[PDB]
Write a protein that binds this DNA or RNA. Structure first.
Ligand SMILES: Nc1ncnc2c1ncn2[C@@H]1O[C@H](C[C@@H](N)CC[C@H](N)C(=O)O)[C@@H](O)[C@H]1O
Ligand SMILES: [K+]
Length: 568
DNA sequence: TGGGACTTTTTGA
DNA sequence: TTCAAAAAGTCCCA
């Protein structure tokens, strides 16, 4: 039988909106096989022939049908031993099917049609007496009053972020799941909590979820809950690899238990090449045991609020830098997010747009995107922002409102602050403070494959795809902008930032203040030469005609100085 | 269809 | 009053 045929057809029958609204995305066979084998390979069926295995978001049964197959083999291979040890009339091969359905397999899901599909599949596992009772619940698993705990829990919970959940349901989650769910958290945090809570003492859970909670600020409470309530046996981190075809998400597999053990050591498997096609191989285990993955151990007792999951060389490197640097960016700098207009099409125009003849130049600001940020310098802006907060009233600037911004008035009126009357329909939603942008400052893209910190000399504005900071006045005599972009753009600081950065998709990390401002910095005898090399690079890059190859050589020299400074 | 360039505004606090 | 986080990303193309 093909346990993945009907579920795949059902998933293909749905549209994008319904799948996103319920997280209806099913797990490929190679992942299911690994997780089921991980949980059930060494189960002692003679000691415990009544194992309770749960998928609380079972869908059409990608996990539970495989659980059925493994359990059938487990019972069948030991049928005469069970017969001798226990009721000899109960333990026959012809009874295994019934037993598995009555006592061992449990599923829950909000989706009534998927439950119906799974019920038919489990029934069709045996050509069939009485009607066998199957333990499938059509319910919201986060609200169900669960009547008992489970020996094994496996699956793939729905992933739904703070924009796609409804506010009423989010009120429920904020009230009832506050130990792991606050602010910009995700629904799968709540599923982690529920799974941990209904796992028996000595039970084992194994799930594939997004990887982002391993590093995200929103995941802090969830990480604390996990490390305080279960022993984490294993983390498989796929980084930016594409595990779910046609899905823009990055994955990890957590296996944990509630066993009374003095172990506290976690096996960490981290992929090396993000470009591998996982499904091209027979099993995940063979990939984990090859040169395609790196393995190392982490002492669970040494985890802080942050989980730094790196090998010994990277740990030594990170610790050297942390110990050597007496300052962080947060100590010496003021950080801020870019403008949020709330409807960019209304306020952002190409600088050559004829409509800008209608707008007085005192309202216009230079506007850049993340792609305009290079190491050390920003591209020339191609766009202009109408800083519409400076429009006093409607009458005096009628054309601007009628012929440019008003084209999106309906959309503009749907913004939260306009509906509440806090913002006029033509104003920017979060216009911040002009004075913060209209000064020398450092700017960096919010998502990038590498450190790209640039000095802005042109009072550029940007949306939230670009973050900025300026150096506090009291630290200007200890750190200049040129020195800071020198060390921040170095190979050393790229590796150092990525030790703890939030890995988003293939070749993309978040560069957000909650981690960028934690970067630590130093000043020593190499300060002057590092700064001079940075100035040389900057001067080359701003030259209209100069070829930039020498920049690389200058950078190599700078990296060497930085390594000497940090003893690495 | 799979891979690469690129990134809005809604939202809780 | 007003901050900053959040990829079951978006979107285009060979
Ligand atoms: N509140 C909920 N309670 C229970 N199930 C839910 C809830 N919300 C969504 N679901 C289901 O969660 C499932 C998540 C899917 N990724 C299916 C996972 C399934 N275990 C599989 O790996 O194939 C979807 O089928 C949803 O219908
Ligand atoms: K017996």
């Amino acid at each position: 039988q093909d346990n993945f045929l009907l579920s795949k057809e059902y998933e293909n029958s749905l549209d994008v909106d319904t799948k996103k609204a319920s997280g209806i995305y099913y797990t490929p066979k190679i992942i299911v096989d690994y997780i089921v084998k991980k949980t059930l390979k060494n189960h002692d069926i003679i000691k415990n022939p009544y194992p309770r295995i749960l998928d609380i978001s079972c869908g059409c049964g990608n996990f539970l049908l495989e659980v059925y197959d493994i359990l059938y083999d487990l019972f069948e291979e030991n049928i005469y031993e069970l017969k001798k040890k226990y009721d000899e009339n109960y333990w026959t091969v012809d009874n295994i099917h019934r037993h598995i359905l009555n006592y061992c397999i449990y599923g829950a899901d909000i989706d009534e049609k998927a439950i119906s599909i799974l019920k038919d599949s489990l029934t069709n596992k045996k050509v069939v007496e009485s009607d066998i009772k199957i333990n499938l619940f059509c319910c919201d698993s986060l609200k169900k009053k669960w009547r008992y705990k489970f020996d094994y829990i496996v699956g793939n919970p729905p992933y739904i972020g703070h924009k796609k959940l409804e506010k009423k349901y989010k009120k429920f989650l904020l009230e009832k799941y506050s130990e792991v769910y606050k602010d910009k958290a995700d629904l799968y945090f709540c599923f982690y909590k529920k799974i941990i809570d209904i796992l028996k003492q000595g039970g084992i859970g194994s799930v594939i979820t997004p990887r982002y909670f391993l590093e995200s600020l929103s995941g802090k409470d969830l990480r604390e809950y996990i490390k305080s309530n279960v022993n984490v046996q294993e983390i498989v981190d796929f980084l930016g690899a594409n595990i779910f075809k046609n899905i823009g998400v990055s994955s990890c597999i957590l296996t944990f238990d509630k066993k009374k053990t003095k172990e506290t050591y976690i096996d960490v498997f981290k992929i090396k090449n993000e470009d591998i096609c996982i499904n091209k191989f027979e099993t995940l285990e063979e990939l984990l045991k090859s040169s395609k993955f790196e393995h190392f151990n982490i002492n669970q007792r040494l985890l802080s609020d942050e989980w730094i999951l790196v090998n010994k060389d990277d740990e030594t490197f990170y610790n050297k830098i942390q110990e050597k640097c007496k300052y962080s960016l947060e100590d010496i700098a003021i950080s801020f997010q870019g403008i949020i207009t709330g409807c960019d099409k209304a306020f952002i125009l190409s600088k050559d747009d004829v409509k800008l003849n209608l707008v007085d130049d005192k309202f216009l600001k230079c506007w850049i995107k993340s792609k305009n940020i290079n190491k050390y310098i920003v591209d020339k802006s191609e766009y202009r922002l109408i800083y519409s907060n400076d429009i006093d009233n409607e009458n005096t600037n009628k054309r601007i409102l009628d012929e440019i911004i008003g084209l999106y008035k309906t959309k503009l009126e749907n913004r939260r602050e306009c509906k509440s009357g806090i913002r006029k329909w033509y104003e920017l939603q979060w216009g911040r403070e002009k004075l913060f942008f209209e000064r020398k400052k450092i700017m960096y893209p919010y998502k990038s494959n590498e450190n790209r910190f640039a000095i802005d000399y042109d009072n550029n504005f940007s949306s939230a795809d670009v973050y900025s900071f300026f150096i506090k006045e009291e630290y200007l005599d200890k750190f200049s902008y040129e020195y800071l972009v020198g060390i921040l753009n170095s190979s050393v600081y790229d590796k150092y930032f990525k030790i703890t950065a939030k890995k988003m998709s293939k070749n993309i990390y978040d560069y957000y203040p909650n981690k960028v401002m934690k970067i630590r910095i130093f000043r020593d005898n190499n300060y002057e030469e590092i700064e001079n090399l940075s100035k040389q690079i900057i001067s080359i890059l701003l030259n209209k005609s100069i070829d930039k190859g020498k920049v690389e050589k200058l950078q190599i020299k700078m990296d060497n100085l930085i390594m000497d400074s940090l003893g690495i």
